Design a protein around this ligand. Structure first.
Ligand SMILES: CC(=O)N[C@@H]1[C@@H](O)[C@H](O[C@@H]2O[C@H](CO[C@H]3O[C@H](CO)[C@@H](O)[C@H](O)[C@@H]3O[C@@H]3O[C@H](CO)[C@@H](O)[C@H](O)[C@H]3NC(C)=O)[C@@H](O)[C@H](O[C@H]3O[C@H](CO)[C@@H](O)[C@H](O)[C@@H]3O[C@@H]3O[C@H](CO)[C@@H](O[C@@H]4O[C@H](CO)[C@H](O)[C@H](O)[C@H]4O)[C@H](O)[C@H]3NC(C)=O)[C@@H]2O)[C@@H](CO)O[C@@H]1O
Ligand SMILES: OC[C@H]1O[C@H](O[C@@H]2[C@H](O)[C@@H](O)O[C@H](CO)[C@H]2O)[C@@H](O)[C@@H](O)[C@@H]1O
Ligand SMILES: *[C@@H]1O[C@H](CO)[C@@H](O)[C@H](O)[C@H]1NC(C)=O
Ligand SMILES: [Ca+2]
Ligand SMILES: [Ca+2]
Ligand SMILES: [Mn+2]
Ligand SMILES: [Mn+2]
Lengths: 240, 240
């Protein structure tokens, strides 16, 4: 289970409970979601994701209960260029989820090209930190960097303008209150700059009772490192 | 991960994070470690165990840290016989642990006959609630029902007299403080009757850095049900 929590203050190399997909790997006590060359620089055309191995019981039909959850994490993006792409996302999906074919670049390794904007064809909730919005390839993005809440589509149901800071860690807190059904996102840089965005969502109609949680990131022709530095998570089934 | 925690107030039939071994299965929101017929009656010659799927980081060689953990659980034993057997145990072992060949009866599904008392051929720490002590078969046991702390051997490093109460739930709290290296056990029946037993053990010299936790139970010629009713576990790495 009714409750589950875990915390990674750092990411040592001897991991046992993480499912690594794509190019994701541990380097310097942090998770490098996207590939990097020998000297630690970001490269183009790369996708990577990680999921915690234990499944989370998001909701239970028999007891009519729904879980609340809180995911706290920090990441940093770095790039030689100034148009780093494509972004990192915290997501929740069915337990057997895998990188969809052709989900690189602006699809963040979460959606397939042909069904990226088809809500009845996906089962995923993600909080994206999108740094690339060129209208030729990312036709669905607002015209500026942003934090978005994605519900079964790459076209966010709600966004807030965000600023990308090269090499600076962003502290994020994602919370889902089953009582109000609000998914709240609070992100802050160390100097106090704060960004907030929320949306009301009934998780029971979007995801199965048991899911897995993790992160995804990608770089198409434009690139940047997507470094996940720490992550804590907790969920508890509740009667509302 | 550095910290992991989970709680099972009850055990619904739909489980995803438990590894079932032997005859263990879910029945009536509880785990029946040993096999029962269609009427829910215990039968002879049965062994079963469960383990949480996520591995627990018990200690870390590189940082000189050892986990502080707590396992709270409750179980009940029932049998029409005057000498129900054989007992249930909470245990900690390497991740790939499986039921040893020929470990039934008094071996509780934790040790192989040929090496049951060879502390050098085993890697396990368990807290047993032993109800069968026939001196002609369980030669290693004291002559009475008991709670025991097992360290790489079926011959407990320590035991205390315990009363078996048919059909009554026993609540148990097992904790380990890495500072004092004390493994404490406190068990209580609903009327306030209490049993305590403690032992100093350096887990680092007994178990690998990553382990799995769970329960094991068995019945030889004599039988009884071994029902795990609830279980919550928490673990956190600390400096020592
Ligand atoms: C290798 C070797 O040398 N072996 C034997 C010893 O085993 C033997 O001792 C006897 O062993 C019996 C079998 O042991 C198995 O079961 C027990 C209990 O579950 C386990 O603890 C053992 O580890 C072992 O378990 C596993 O069994 C499976 C399957 O059989 C096997 O595959 C596994 O390999 C095995 N595991 C291992 C590690 O070996 C044991 O049952 C005997 O215990 C009885 O007898 C002693 C005295 O001799 C007594 O103190 C006990 O309480 C028990 O008493 C009997 O209890 C039953 C149940 O109540 C009675 O039957 C009931 O009686 C009432 C009347 O009152 C009615 O009639 C009911 O209908 C009826 O059910 C029965 O009457 C009791 N019998 C007696 C004599 O009192 C014992 O320890 C020794 C000596 O025989 O020889 C070898 O060393
Ligand atoms: O990684 C950024 C982006 O790269 C790819 O699209 C390209 C960009 O829009 C830009 O470089 O212009 C190119 C030419 O029009 C275009 O290919 C894709 O991989 C895209 O998904 C990704 O977001
Ligand atoms: C103890 O177990 C080890 C490893 O299995 C074995 O090599 C050794 O012979 C055993 N010692 C005794 C005294 O049985
Ligand atoms: Ca984009
Ligand atoms: Ca015994
Ligand atoms: Mn976007
Ligand atoms: Mn014993």
């Amino acid at each position: 289970q009714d409750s589950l929590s875990f915390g990674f203050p750092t990411f040592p190399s001897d991991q046992k409970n993480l499912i690594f997909q794509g190019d994701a790997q541990i380097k310097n006590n942090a998770v490098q979601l996207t590939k990097t060359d020998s000297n630690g620089n970001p490269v183009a055309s790369t996708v990577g994701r990680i999921l915690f191995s234990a499944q989370v019981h998001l909701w239970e039909k028999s007891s009519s209960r729904v879980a609340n959850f809180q995911s706290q994490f920090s990441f940093s993006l770095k790039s030689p260029l100034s148009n780093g792409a494509d972004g990192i996302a915290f997501f929740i999906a069915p337990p057997d989820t895998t990188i969809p074919s052709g989900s690189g670049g602006g699809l963040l390794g979460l959606f397939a090209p042909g069904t990226a904007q088809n809500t009845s064809a996906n089962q995923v909730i993600a909080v994206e930190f999108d740094t690339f919005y060129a209208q030729d390839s990312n036709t669905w993005d607002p015209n500026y960097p942003h934090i978005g809440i994605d519900v079964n589509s790459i076209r966010s149901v709600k966004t807030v303008k965000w600023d990308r800071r090269d090499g600076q860690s962003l502290n994020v807190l994602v919370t889902f209150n089953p009582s109000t059904r609000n998914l709240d996102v609070v992100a802050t840089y160390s100097d106090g700059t704060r960004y907030e965005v929320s949306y009301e969502v009934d998780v029971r109609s979007v995801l199965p009772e048991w899911v897995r949680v993790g992160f995804s990131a990608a770089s198409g022709e434009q690139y940047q490192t997507h470094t996940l530095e720490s992550w804590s998570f907790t969920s508890t089934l509740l009667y509302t």
